[PDB]
Design a protein around this ligand. Sequence first.
Ligand SMILES: Nc1ncnc2c1ncn2[C@@H]1O[C@H](COP(=O)(O)OP(=O)(O)OP(=O)(O)O)[C@@H](O)[C@H]1O
Ligand SMILES: Nc1ncnc2c1ncn2[C@@H]1O[C@H](COP(=O)(O)OP(=O)(O)OP(=O)(O)O)[C@@H](O)[C@H]1O
Ligand SMILES: [Cl-]
Ligand SMILES: [Zn+2]
Ligand SMILES: [Zn+2]
Lengths: 69, 69
Amino acid sequence: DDDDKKTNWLKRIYRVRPCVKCKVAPRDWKVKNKHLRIYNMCKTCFNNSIDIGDDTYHGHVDWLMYADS
Amino acid sequence: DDDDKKTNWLKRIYRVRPCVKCKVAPRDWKVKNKHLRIYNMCKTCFNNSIDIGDDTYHGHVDWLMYADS
Ligand SMILES: Nc1ncnc2c1ncn2[C@@H]1O[C@H](COP(=O)(O)OP(=O)(O)OP(=O)(O)O)[C@@H](O)[C@H]1O
Ligand SMILES: Nc1ncnc2c1ncn2[C@@H]1O[C@H](COP(=O)(O)OP(=O)(O)OP(=O)(O)O)[C@@H](O)[C@H]1O
Ligand SMILES: [Cl-]
Ligand SMILES: [Zn+2]
Ligand SMILES: [Zn+2]
């Protein structure tokens, strides 16, 4: 089923690329309508980036959650 | 740059999962507005599926080509 191909891919993408900052924890994310937003950092590193004044790693990638647009 | 994270991922996704039918050739695809449609089969297997009367492998997965929805 093509929706399952998309879901399996999103599980893999989320699993295999951890937080860009600590390189260990999984990334924060949210659901944004029909999209999954995967932020670049875990929550702990993101909150810390605000404290330390670094926006270098801020950002996200949005993924359509379904196989058909 | 977050758009590059998306583009690099789409290159990887396209590369690592060949045609679901012959298991060798890369899949057919097209650009569908702001989406990349990756069909399940290469063109040769898709055309052949029409000739042989099998719709089992018909289908596709659409991917947003940009990091921000
Ligand atoms: N965990 C995180 N890691 C990296 N960047 C993040 C993280 N959380 C938020 N950001 C950055 O913070 C900014 C705000 O994100 P957010 O998803 O809240 O945007 P939005 O579209 O304004 O949604 P809303 O206004 O409803 O919160 C974006 O630059 C986003 O990439
Ligand atoms: N190479 C292929 N492998 C598997 N399935 C395919 C392939 N090419 C087309 N299909 C299937 O054929 C059908 C038509 O696809 P297509 O992308 O042409 O749809 P569409 O949204 O009707 O666009 P248009 O009407 O502009 O052609 C869909 O079920 C699609 O998955
Ligand atoms: Cl996507
Ligand atoms: Zn982290
Ligand atoms: Zn094939």
